[PDB]
Design a protein around this ligand. Structure first.
Ligand SMILES: *[C@@H]1O[C@H](CO)[C@@H](O[C@@H]2O[C@H](CO)[C@@H](O)[C@H](O)[C@H]2NC(C)=O)[C@H](O)[C@H]1NC(C)=O
Lengths: 89, 49, 49
């Protein structure tokens, strides 16, 4: 409770909310973009890198990566403390 | 080409609701304790009268 | 080994650009040249409620 709101990428904050019970996102994604493998303007690797990334997206390799590293939830989410008053009475 | 499509969003504290000792006593204030005591005792004694 | 559609027209120099609901994959990206995507899409499954 030192910062009221943190503005950041959807993936990171969604992962943190999945891991941390006390942290939650709000949704309504804005400024949609994509993480990319940036490199120098004149580099022969780029043409093949794009094709390799698209090929990896084509099959289930990227889905497997999402399953292994990103897509796993620990905690997502009346109670005893709510009726604690009548028990106190 | 992007390898993960995502946007910008907001992270905040969950702030689980807090339930306290007087969760049954919000509807009426503390003055109503004395008010109901007076309205019950005075009625009872005058019925006995 | 013959392309038809917007990809076919672009391959044979009959159209400089192909603007529309074009899905990016490996074969199209290796036969012609694409740009940065402007909207997210992909394979999806939809059923009656
Ligand atoms: C991108 O991939 C292509 C496909 O393999 C590479 O082209 C080959 O390059 C090797 C070495 O230069 C040649 O021996 C082959 O004959 C080429 N094959 C074809 C079909 O062109 C290309 O070199 C790769 N580019 C980079 C930067 O790695």
């Amino acid at each position: 409770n030192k910062l009221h709101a943190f503005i950041w990428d959807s993936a990171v904050l969604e992962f943190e909310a999945s891991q941390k019970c006390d942290l939650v996102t709000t949704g309504e994604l804005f400024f949609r973009s994509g993480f990319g493998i940036g490199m120098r303007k004149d580099s022969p690797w780029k043409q093949n890198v794009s094709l390799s990334i698209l090929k990896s997206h084509e099959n289930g390799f990227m889905e497997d990566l999402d399953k292994t590293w990103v897509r796993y939830q620990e905690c997502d989410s009346l109670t005893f403390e709510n009726m604690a008053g009548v028990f106190m009475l | 080409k992007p390898f993960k499509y995502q946007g910008l969003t907001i992270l905040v504290k969950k702030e689980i609701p807090r339930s306290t000792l007087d969760s049954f006593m919000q509807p009426f204030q503390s003055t109503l304790w004395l008010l109901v005591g007076l309205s019950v005792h005075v009625v009872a004694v005058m019925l006995y009268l | 080994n013959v392309w038809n559609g917007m990809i076919g027209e672009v391959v044979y120099q009959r159209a400089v650009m192909a603007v529309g609901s074009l899905t990016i994959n490996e074969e199209r990206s290796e036969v012609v040249d694409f740009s940065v995507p402007f909207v997210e899409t992909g394979i999806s499954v939809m059923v009656s409620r």
